[PDB]
Ligand binder design. Structure first.
Ligand SMILES: OC[C@H]1O[C@H](OCC#Cc2cccnc2)[C@@H](O)[C@@H](O)[C@@H]1O
Ligand code: NI
Length: 158
């Protein structure tokens, strides 16, 4: 089991860390959503699907910088929605193919009433999403840590 990003970089077998840059709507009003869909960016595969089933959860989603201070939000993981920052590890998604399949995570962020001006700065860290991988074969228990960076400023109009 390993993951890579579109562009991109890779996290090899045994887990590790990678940095991900996301394009964000430059302008978002109170009551609107920023949608950050990582499912077009992060892809994973099972290295031995005939003998092994891989289980993948979103172990934790954490907010940083302008997202932490100026947004509230939810995370959608494989069809189910959760508070973001998360309060528990999700149910598992099965990886059972050698073909790269998306990691089905998307953030829905909405400005708090105190956001105004540049709410998210370009190049800044906005979120960490931890992928936890296990299997039905051995004791492997690995973390794939995705540091999510804003590609551009996001302005909340005043
Ligand atoms: O993707 C399947 C497995 O690939 C890697 O495992 C390598 C192996 C193997 C193997 C398969 C069949 C028999 N003996 C060993 C690890 O990422 C492991 O965690 C993962 O579950
Ligand atoms: Ni592989």
């Amino acid at each position: 089991f390993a993951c890579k990003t579109a562009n991109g970089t890779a996290i090899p077998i045994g887990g590790g860390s990678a940095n991900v840059y996301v394009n964000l709507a430059p302008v978002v009003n109170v009551g609107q959503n920023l949608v950050v869909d990582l499912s077009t960016q992060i892809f994973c595969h099972n290295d031995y699907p005939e003998t092994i089933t891989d289980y993948v959860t979103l172990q934790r989603g954490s907010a940083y910088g302008g997202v932490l201070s100026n947004f509230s939000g939810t995370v959608k993981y494989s069809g189910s929605s959760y508070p973001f920052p998360t309060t528990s590890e999700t149910p598992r998604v099965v990886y059972n193919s050698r073909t790269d399949k998306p990691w089905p995570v998307a953030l829905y962020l909405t400005p708090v009433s105190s956001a105004g001006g540049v709410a998210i700065k370009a190049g800044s860290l906005i979120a960490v999403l931890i992928l936890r991988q296990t299997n039905n074969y051995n004791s492997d228990d690995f973390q794939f840590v995705w540091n999510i960076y804003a590609n551009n400023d996001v302005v909340v109009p005043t």
